[PDB]
C-alpha cells in the first residue's frame, strides 16, 4: 500500500499532496551474463491529491521513477504524464531498467513527483533499494 | 499459443491484461559467416484486453519485441502501435534480428506490452531463448 | 515468376499474403577496380494480397530489398511505399548496389515485405545470392 | 520565512520586487557511494511584487535555483516559469541536485529571479550553503 | 543519337521506357595541375515514354548522370526533376565533374533513370568511359 | 547617474542617442575557490532617445552588457530587447557573470547599444572595470 | 565584350543560349601578406537568350562565377538568380575572392550558367586566368 | 565625408552607385592585454544611388564592413540590410572588432556594397588601415 507521501502548500494556497504506493524494485540476474551489470524490474503506483481553491480544476504533470547511483547519479522517469482534476493515480507493472560499469553494488532511490502547470512541484521519496 | 500473460489493476480501476502468443525466435546461420554474429528472426503475437469503467473507450498503445542480452542490454520493439477499444491484438511473422561482437552465446527475453494514454502500463515477459 | 511468398493471418482476422517475383541480383566487375569491392544491380517485384473482413479498405506498406551479409549485416530497402486497397504490387529493374571492405565473399538475402498500418506485418524470404 | 529580497525600479517606473522564502539545501550521502560526489535536495519558495503604472498588466518569468561552485561555476534553475499580474509566487519541495569531481567541498549560492518581458530582470541572493 | 534504353512493365501494366541520347564525358587536364585529379564535363539527353492505361496522366521523376569509380563507388545526379505526362525529356550541356586521389585511372558509368510516383522504377546504363 | 552617452545622425536624418547609467560591476571572491576564476554581478541601466522626422514611429533593439578580456575578448549581452518609439530604456540588477582560466586579471569593458530596425547603430562605452 | 557563349536545344525544342561578357579577374597582393595566399577581384556579365516555343514564358536560373584550381577544384557562384522572359542579364563588379595553401600559383576557370526550371541546363566556359 | 565610390551600369540599364563615407578604424590597447591581439572600433556610413528606368522600384541589400588580413582572409559584414528606393544609406558608430594570433600586424580593407535583388552587385573599396 502506501510507502510514502509528502504534501506542500503551493504559491496559490493549494495543498498539493503526492503519494508512492506498492513500490517493488525486482532485481534479476543480467541477460548479458556480466558481473558488472545490474538488471531489475520497477513496479509501483503514484497518486496525487489537491485541496483548496480551484482544486477541481487542476493542471499538472505526475511522475514516477527512481534515481540510480553507481557510475554517477541519473534519474529515470518510468512514466511522466499530464493530469487534471483534484485526484488521481497511475500505476506501473514490470518497467525494465538496467545499468553497467557497476563496480561494487548499485543503489536505487524510488520517487513519486507532482508538478503543477503553475510551476510548483513536490516530490516524495522512499528508502533506497540495494541492487546487489 | 498462449505463451505468457499479465494483469494490472490500473489507476482508474481498469483491469488491464496483456498476452504473448505464438512466439518463435528462429536462429539461423549468419549471412556474414562470422562466428561472432548471431542472426534470428522474431515471430509471434501480442494480445491485450481491458475490463472495467470505460473499457470500450480505452486509448493506449500495444507493443511486442525482445531484449538482447550480449554486447550489453538493448530493447528492440518489433512493433509499437496505437490501439482503441476494449480488445484487439497485432501479430508478426518473420521480423529480422541480428547482432555481432557476440562473445560466447546471446540470450533473448521476449516481452508483450500494454501502455495506456493515461500513463499506466503493464508488460508480460516470457522465458529467454539462447541464440547458440 | 513467383520466387516465393508467405502468408500471415492478422490480428483483425485478415488473411495477409506477400509474394516476391522475378528476382535478379546481377553481380558485376567493380568500377573502382578494387578486389575488396562488390558491385551489383537489383531487379525484382513485390506484390501482395489481402482477403477476409474489410479487404477493400486496407492501409499498409509494401517493401522489396535485401540484407547485405559480409562486412556486417545491413538491411537495404530498394523500395518502400504506401499502399491501399485489396491488391497491389511494384517493380524495379536495375537498382544499384556496391559494398567494400569485403573479406572475400558477399552473401545477399532478398526479401519482400507487406506491413499493415494496424501494426501487423508479414515477410517472405528467398534463398541468398552469392556475389562472388 | 523570508530569507532575502531585492527591488528594482525598472525602465518604465514600475518598482519590481523579488523574494526568496523557506530555503532548505538538504545535503545527504551520495547514492553512488562516491566520496567525490555531493548530493542534496533543494526546497524553496519564490515570490515577486510589482508596484506602479500598469502593474496589473505585468508579463515576465519567475525563477528559483542556485549556483554550484566547485568544479567551476554553473547555474541551475530549479524552476523557471511565465507569470502575469502584479503578484505571484511558486514553491518547490525536494528537488534533487548532484555534482561530481568535487575536489574538496561544494558551495551553493541560492537565488530568486524575476525577469520582465520588457528585458528588466532583478535577482536576489542568499548566503551560500556548504555541501560538506 | 540513342546510346541505350530499357523498358519495364510496372506494377500497373504501364510500359515504362527510359532513354539516354548524345552522351559525352569530356575529360580534360585538371585545373589544379595534379596527377591524381580527374576533371571532366558531362553532356547527354534523358528521354522517357509511358505506354498503356492511365498514361497521359503520369506522375514521376526523371534523372541523368553517372557513377564514379576510383576511391569508391559514388552516384552523381547531374539533374533530377519531377515530370508528368506520358512523354517527356530533359537535356544537359557541359555539366562539371571532378574527383581526386585518382590512384591510377577513373571509370565513369552513365545512366538514365525513370521513377514513378507509384514506387516502380526503371534505369538504363551505358558502358563506362575511362577518364585516363 | 549618467556614466556616458553617444549620438549618431543615422541614414534617415534622425539623431540617435544611447546612454549608460548606474553601471556596477560587483567583483566577489569566486564560488569555486579557484585562483584562476573571476565572479561578479552586473547592475545597470540603458536609455535611448531619437530626434527628428518619424521619431514617434522608431523601431529598434536596445542592448546593455560588456566585453570580457583575459582568456580572449568575448561579448556578453546581459539583455537585448525590441523597443519602439522615441524614448525608453531598461535596467538590470544583480545579473551573474563568471569566467575561468584567468591567467592574471580580467578587464571588463561595459557598453549600452542602440540598433535601429533600419540597420543603423550606435554604441557607447564605459571605462573598463578591473575585475582584479 | 563577348568572351564566350554556348547554346543548347533543350528538352522542349526551345533554343537556349548562355553568354559571358567583359570578364576580369584582377589579382592583388594579398591582404594577409602571406605568399601562399592568392587574392583577387572578379568582374563580369552574364546574359541569356531563349528562342522557340513558349520562350516568353521561360522560367530559369542564371549563375556566373569561376572554378578554383589549387588545393583542389572548388566552385564559387558569385551570383545565382531566378530570371524569366525570353531575355535577361545580370552584371557584377568587384566581388572578392581568396584562396590559401596554394602551392605555387592558382588557376581560375570562369563560367556563365543557365539552368531552367524544367531541369535543363547549359553552361559556357572561358579560358582560365592564371593567378600568379 | 566621401571616402570612395563605384558605379555599375547593371543588367537592366540602371546605373547603380555605392559610396563609403566617414570611415574610422580605431585601434586600441587590447582588453585581453595580449600583444598577439588586435582590437578596434569601426565607424562609417554606406550610401547608394540608382538612376534609370525603374529606379523608384529598386530592392536590394546595402552592406558595410571590411576584410581582415592576418591569420587568414575573412570578411566581416558590420551591417547588412534590405533597402527599397532610388536613394538610401545607413551609418554605424563604434562597432567592435578583434582578432588574435596577430603574428605581427593586421591590415583591414574597408568596403561598401550594393546588391540588387536582380542579382547584380557593386562594391567600393578603401585603402587598408594597418592595425598596429
Interface contact H123-G37, CB threshold 8 A: no
Q: CB under 8 Å to F74, separation ≥6 — which residues? A: F67, F68, F99
Closest CA to A90 of A68, A51, A53, A60: A60
Is G92 in contact with G79 (CB distance < 8 Å)? Answer: yes
Distance CA G78, CA H119 (A): 9
Q: CB under 8 Å to A82, separation ≥6 — which residues? A: A60, A61
Distance CA E44, CA E3 (A): 10
Say whether G57 sits in a helix, a strand or coil.
helix
Distance CA C5, CA B91 (A): 18
Over its C-alpha atoms, chain B yields an Rg (Å, rounded) of 16
Kindly report the three-state secondary structure assignment for every residue of chain A.
CEEEEEEEECCCCCEEEEEEEEEEEEEECCCCCCCCCEEEEEEEEEEEEEECCCCCCCEEEEEEEEEEECCCEEEEEEEEEEEECCEEEEEEEEEEEEECCCCCCCEEEEEEEEEECCCCEEEEECCCEECC
**B·C CB contacts under 8 A:** 67
Is E78 in contact with E91 (CB distance < 8 Å)? Answer: no
C-alpha cell, E88? 517527356
Distances (CA, A) of H46 to G13, H50, H92, H125: 47, 14, 9, 11
Closest CA to F102 of F43, F56, F40, F45: F40
Distance CA C45, CA E48 (A): 21
Is F21 in contact with F1 (CB distance < 8 Å)? Answer: yes
Distance from CA of D129 to the nearest CA of F (A): 11
Q: CB under 8 Å to E127, separation ≥6 — which residues? A: none
C-alpha cell, E31? 585545373
Distance CA A17, CA A14 (A): 10
C-alpha cell, G24? 576580369
Is H70 in contact with H101 (CB distance < 8 Å)? Answer: yes
Q: Does F32 touch chain H (CB under 8 A)?
A: no
Is A6 in contact with A112 (CB distance < 8 Å)? Answer: no
Residue with cell 555599375: H8
* C-alpha angle H119-H125-H129 in degrees, rounded to nearest 5: 145
Is D120 in contact with F91 (CB distance < 8 Å)? Answer: yes
Is F69 in contact with F107 (CB distance < 8 Å)? Answer: yes
Residue with cell 540513342: E2
| Number of separate helices (H) and strands (E) present in chain G | 0, 9
Cβ-count burial of B74 within 10 angstroms (0-12 exposed, 13-18 middle, 19+ buried)? middle
Distance CA E47, CA E113 (A): 9
Distance CA D86, CA B81 (A): 47
Distance CA D51, CA D74 (A): 32
Distance CA F31, CA F37 (A): 9
Q: Which long-range contacts (CB under 8 A, 24 or more apart) does C82-87 make?
A: C83/C48, C83/C58, C83/C59, C84/C58, C84/C59, C84/C60, C85/C56, C85/C58, C86/C49, C86/C50, C86/C51, C86/C55, C86/C56, C86/C58, C87/C47, C87/C48, C87/C49, C87/C50
Distances (CA, A) of E90 to C67, E43, E113, E123, F81: 35, 12, 12, 15, 51
Whether H and G touch, i.e. at least 3 CB pairs below 8 A, reads as: yes
What is the number of other CB atoms lying within 10 angstroms of the CB of residue E56? Answer: 9
Distance CA E63, CA E51 (A): 19
C-alpha cell, A122? 513536490
User: Quick one: DSSP state of residue G127?
Assistant: P
Cβ-count burial of D53 within 10 angstroms (0-12 exposed, 13-18 middle, 19+ buried)? exposed
Distance CA H27, CA H131 (A): 6
Distance CA B11, CA F117 (A): 55
Say whether C55 sits in a helix, a strand or coil.
helix
DSSP chain E: -EEEEEEEE-TTS-EEEEEEEEEEEEEE--TT--TT-EEEEEEEEEEEEEESTTTTS-EEEEEEEEEEESSSEEEEEEEEEEEESSEEEEEEEEEEEEE----S--EEEEEEEEEETTS-EEEEE-PPEE--
Distance CA E41, CA E39 (A): 7
The answer for C 41-60 residues in CB contact with E (under 8 A) is: 45, 47
Q: Is F86 left (phi over 0), alpha (psi -120 to 50) or beta?
A: alpha
Residue with cell 502500463: B121
Distance CA A130, CA A127 (A): 10
Whether D and E touch, i.e. at least 3 CB pairs below 8 A, reads as: no
Distance CA E66, CA G84 (A): 30
Interface contact B92-C118, CB threshold 8 A: no
Distance CA D14, CA D117 (A): 13
Q: What is the dihedral of CA D29, D34, D37, D39, to 10 degrees?
A: -20
Classify strands E107-116 and E59-69 as parallel, antiparallel or unpaired.
antiparallel
Stated length of chain A: 132
Is A67 in contact with A74 (CB distance < 8 Å)? Answer: yes
Q: CB under 8 Å to H12, separation ≥6 — which residues? A: G89, H52, H53, H54, H118
Cβ-count burial of D101 within 10 angstroms (0-12 exposed, 13-18 middle, 19+ buried)? exposed
What is the number of other CB atoms lying within 10 angstroms of the CB of residue G126? Answer: 18
C-alpha cell, H64? 558595410
Cβ-Cβ contacts under 8 Å, G6 against chain E: 93-94
Distances (CA, A) of F106 to D101, F40, H102: 26, 11, 20
Q: Give the CATH number, domain containing residue F57.
A: 2.60.40.1650
Distance CA G112, CA B131 (A): 62
Q: Which residue range is the domain that position B1 belongs to?
A: 1-132
Cβ-Cβ contacts under 8 Å, D90 against chain A: 10-11, 118-120
What is the number of other CB atoms lying within 10 angstroms of the CB of residue E111? Answer: 23
What is the number of other CB atoms lying within 10 angstroms of the CB of residue H54? Answer: 12
Interface contact D94-A9, CB threshold 8 A: no
Classify strands H121-125 and G87-99 as parallel, antiparallel or unpaired.
parallel
End-to-end Cα spacing for chain F? 24
Distance CA A25, CA A3 (A): 13
Interface contact E73-C45, CB threshold 8 A: no
The answer for D 56-95 residues in CB contact with A (under 8 A) is: 62, 79-81, 88-95
Residue with cell 523608384: H56
C-alpha cell, F70? 583575459
For B31, the closest of C12, C69, C121 (CB atoms) is: C69
User: Quick one: DSSP state of residue B35?
Assistant: T
Name the helix (H) or strand (E) containing G13: none
Q: From start to end of chain C, where are the E strands? A: 2-9, 15-28, 38-51, 59-69, 73-84, 87-99, 107-116, 121-125, 129-130
What is the number of other CB atoms lying within 10 angstroms of the CB of residue A36? Answer: 15
Mutation target among G26, G40, G94, G114 for the H interface, most CBs of H within 10 A = G94
**Which chains pack against B, by 3+ Cβ pairs within 8 A?**
A, C
What is the number of other CB atoms lying within 10 angstroms of the CB of residue F60? Answer: 22
Is G93 in contact with H8 (CB distance < 8 Å)? Answer: yes
Q: Does G33 touch chain H (CB under 8 A)?
A: yes
Residue with cell 543603423: F120
Distance CA A98, CA B72 (A): 10
Is F110 in contact with F77 (CB distance < 8 Å)? Answer: no
Cβ-Cβ contacts under 8 Å, G11 against chain E: 45-46, 88-91
**Which chains pack against D, by 3+ Cβ pairs within 8 A?**
A, F
Distance CA E89, CA G91 (A): 32
When divided into structural domains, chain H yields a total of 1
Cβ-Cβ contacts under 8 Å, B45 against chain C: 11
**Which chains pack against C, by 3+ Cβ pairs within 8 A?**
B, E
* E-chain residue closest to G16, CA distance: E93
Closest CA to H39 of F120, G31, F20, F74: F74
Residue B55 dihedral angles phi and psi, to the nearest 5°: -50, -45
Which approach determined this entry? X-ray
Whether E and A touch, i.e. at least 3 CB pairs below 8 A, reads as: no
Cβ-Cβ contacts under 8 Å, F105 against chain H: 33
C-alpha cell, D101? 569531481
Q: From start to end of chain D, where are the E strands? A: 2-9, 15-28, 37-51, 59-69, 73-84, 87-100, 107-116, 121-125, 129-130
Distance CA D121, CA D115 (A): 4
End-to-end Cα spacing for chain A? 25
The sign of the dihedral angle between the CA atoms of A99, A102, A107, A109 is negative
Is B84 in contact with B58 (CB distance < 8 Å)? Answer: yes
Q: Does A27 touch chain B (CB under 8 A)?
A: no
Residue with cell 501487423: C120
Helix runs in A1-124, H state only: none
Residue with cell 514611429: F57
Closest CA to A65 of A81, A86, A84, A85: A81
Residue D12 dihedral angles phi and psi, to the nearest 5°: -125, 35
Amino acid at each position: 500500500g502506501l510507502d510514502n507521501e509528502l504534501s506542500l502548500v503551493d504559491g496559490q494556497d493549494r495543498t498539493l499532496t503526492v503519494q508512492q504506493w506498492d513500490t517493488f524494485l525486482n532485481g534479476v540476474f543480467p541477460l548479458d551474463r556480466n558481473r558488472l551489470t545490474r538488471e531489475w524490474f520497477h513496479s509501483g503506483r503514484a497518486k496525487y491529491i489537491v485541496a483548496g481553491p480551484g482544486a477541481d480544476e487542476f493542471e499538472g504533470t505526475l511522475e514516477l521513477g527512481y534515481q540510480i547511483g553507481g557510475p554517477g547519479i541519473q534519474e529515470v522517469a518510468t512514466f511522466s504524464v499530464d493530469v487534471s482534476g483534484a485526484e488521481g493515480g497511475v500505476a506501473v507493472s514490470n518497467a525494465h531498467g538496467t545499468v553497467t560499469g557497476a563496480a561494487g553494488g548499485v543503489l536505487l532511490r524510488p520517487f513519486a513527483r507532482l508538478i503543477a502547470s503553475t510551476g510548483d512541484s513536490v516530490t516524495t521519496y522512499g528508502e533506497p533499494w540495494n541492487m546487489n
